């Protein structure tokens, strides 16, 4: 089964709490790495490719069958340098960092088989959790900032087979792991079925976030999305009165360089 | 059980809170010498990794586990860097390791081809040829078996009793530090002008019970001008409002 590439839009998803500060009934303008609104998001589904990490990754899935179970993050994934393995084994959740020699087709199945990697190495640390259409939307944001691997997430009930549902919900911080390695690529680990995910990238962006009375982010404006969004951002309001507002500066960019000296 | 000095045991201590004042204050350590660190500096400074190295060695050899020192153990069994940061802790184990007739279970190396590199461990059993003639199996012609046993008697000289030694090596890498000493907390004081420090957030003000609710991951809040308005106590998950002192 050979599948084509496919893409969709991010709509208003990919916003997360940038900090642990409580705010109430205010609009807060912040600059951080965020998935742009309506950004092109790659749609995968027989698919376990290795993808770049870039600045950070927005990952989402729409599943009812518990097929997507984990991620591999690292620079090379070839046992020469350290990589972070985060896997839900349907027993516990294991997070460990090692110079693993990864398989060229890692997968899980039923649990009846665990491959993922061949050889292992001296891990810096290991964490193991306590033992334990589509109906479940799981959203994650993965960032590598100053040696710390930060994960934000949300679980939203859904009823949609073909695409991400539209709406707005902010992701909450999940973990802040002291990893200390460079991450340039990652791979998604899925279980084999026995008796559908979206990947986008974060970019430096300024957002005006709306906090409700209880400190929950209920809406946001992506300042670079549209002149109307720029107007909303400069006025620190989601309601703009009739009138003319100066929001930016039109600058012609150079495209070529000229170096001239006498012959 | 402690490992022999030749094949010493290295326990990697990471991702934890390291209580060091208890080790210094605890009784019956025959020696506790810190190189580059101090009991008044530990229990505070954060490190990336701590490596504990445990060996059983004769009392006369305790002086050899130190930076800048030489000797049979320092050179062939456990070489410590001269540029060493950490503490060497040791205590008498005469009532643990000695056995009637002599405890010969602990081995040490006397015959080695070259000096051991700092923190390098060797588990080789290869016969030392002493630079004379081919061995082709150990024989009594300038050819020796590298490992010998200790004779730890219940009654012996103090310098000949077994001692257990733990060396705590402190390692700083570019990774975020993970091993920190314990933090100390004070009692919470309300309705007074008090200087406070909640985690890394400091200030002066009056703490009162708050009627605001914060999400499980939010630790403090701010007002309309980004001035801290309330904090969630690190130990009691309640919201406290901060009123400026008049």
């Amino acid at each position: 089964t050979q599948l084509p590439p496919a893409y969709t839009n991010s709509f208003t998803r990919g916003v997360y709490y940038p900090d642990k500060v409580f705010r109430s009934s205010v609009l807060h303008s912040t600059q951080d790495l965020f998935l742009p609104f309506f950004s092109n998001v790659t749609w995968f589904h027989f698919d376990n490719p290795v993808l770049p990490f870039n600045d950070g990754v927005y990952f989402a899935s729409t599943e009812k069958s518990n097929i997507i179970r984990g991620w591999i993050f690292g620079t090379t994934l070839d046992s020469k340098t350290q990589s972070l393995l985060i896997v839900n084994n349907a027993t516990n959740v294991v997070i460990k960092v090692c110079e693993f020699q990864f398989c060229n087709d890692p997968f899980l199945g039923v649990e009846s088989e665990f491959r993922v990697y061949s050889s292992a190495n001296n891990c810096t640390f290991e964490y193991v959790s306590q033992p334990f259409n589509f109906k479940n939307l799981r959203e994650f944001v993965f960032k590598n900032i100053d040696g710390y691997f930060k994960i934000y997430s949300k679980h939203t009930p859904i009823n949609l087979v073909r695409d991400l549902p539209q709406g707005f919900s902010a992701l909450e911080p999940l973990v802040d792991l002291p990893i200390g390695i460079n991450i340039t690529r990652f791979q998604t680990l899925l279980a084999l079925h026995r008796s559908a995910y979206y990947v986008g990238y974060l970019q430096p962006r300024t957002f005006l976030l709306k906090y409700n009375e209880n400190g929950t982010i209920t809406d946001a404006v992506d300042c670079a999305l549209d002149p109307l969004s720029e107007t909303k951002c400069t006025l620190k309001s989601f309601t703009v009165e009739k009138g003319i507002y100066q929001t930016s500066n039109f600058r012609v960019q150079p495209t070529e360089s000229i170096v001239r000296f006498p012959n | 059980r402690f490992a022999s000095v030749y094949a010493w045991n290295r326990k990697r201590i990471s991702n934890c809170v390291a209580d060091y004042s208890v080790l210094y204050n605890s009784a019956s350590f025959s020696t506790f010498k810190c190189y580059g660190v101090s009991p008044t500096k530990l229990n505070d400074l954060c490190f990336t990794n701590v490596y504990a190295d445990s060996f059983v060695i004769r009392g006369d050899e305790v002086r050899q586990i130190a930076p800048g020192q030489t000797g049979k153990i320092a050179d062939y069994n456990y070489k410590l860097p001269d540029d060493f940061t950490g503490c060497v802790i040791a205590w008498n184990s005469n009532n643990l390791d000695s056995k009637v007739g002599g405890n010969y279970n602990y081995l040490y190396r006397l015959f080695r081809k070259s000096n051991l590199k700092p923190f390098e461990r060797d588990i080789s059993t290869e016969i030392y040829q002493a630079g004379s003639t081919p061995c082709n199996g150990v024989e009594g012609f300038n050819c020796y078996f590298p490992l010998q046993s200790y004779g730890f008697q219940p009654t012996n000289g103090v310098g000949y009793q077994p001692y257990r030694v733990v060396v705590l090596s402190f390692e700083l890498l570019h990774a975020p530090a993970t091993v920190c000493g314990p933090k100390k907390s004070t009692n919470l004081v309300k309705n007074k002008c008090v200087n406070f420090n909640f985690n890394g957030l400091t200030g002066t003000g009056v703490l009162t019970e708050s009627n605001k609710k914060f999400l499980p991951f939010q630790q403090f809040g701010r007002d309309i001008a980004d001035t801290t308005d309330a904090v969630r106590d690190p130990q009691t998950l309640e919201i406290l409002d901060i009123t400026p002192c008049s």
Partner: nanobody, 123 residues
Framework: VQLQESGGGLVQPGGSLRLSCAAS????????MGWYRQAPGKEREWVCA????????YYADSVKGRFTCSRDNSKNTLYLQMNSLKPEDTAVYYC??????????????????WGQGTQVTVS
């Protein structure tokens, strides 16, 4: 986790004895192991040593040639085939494991695990 020694016995001068010992788990595989002896009136001394993965064996001057020591890596069992015994050979024999390489999991790689003792008598 533990080592158990066996074999031993009484022989006439010139006879032979097959001694053996074994250990549970990953004690012998990928580790060196050897033999020591202690005469009833003497301190314990080294007899021989064989590298489990290596397979070569070194012998003491009183051991080399006269008798050999071997191993089985699949059964993690050590053997000693003693021959040409003399009255001077009467002793209790022990086998023991040398410390091994670092093992990232919960292990006792650095310990020696000395056995109980196998009595060999010549008369």
């Amino acid at each position: 986790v533990q080592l158990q020694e066996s074999g031993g016995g009484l022989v006439q001068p010139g006879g032979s004895l097959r001694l053996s010992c074994a250990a549970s788990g990953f004690t012998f595989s990928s580790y060196a192991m050897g033999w020591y002896r202690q005469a009833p009136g003497k301190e314990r001394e080294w007899v021989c040593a064989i590298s489990g993965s290596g397979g070569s064996t070194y012998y003491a001057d009183s051991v080399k040639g006269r008798f050999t020591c071997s191993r089985d890596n699949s059964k993690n069992t050590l053997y000693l085939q003693m021959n040409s015994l003399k009255p001077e050979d009467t002793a209790v024999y022990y086998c023991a494991r040398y410390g091994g390489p670092y093992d990232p999991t919960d292990s006792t790689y650095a310990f020696d695990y000395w056995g109980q003792g196998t009595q060999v008598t010549v008369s």
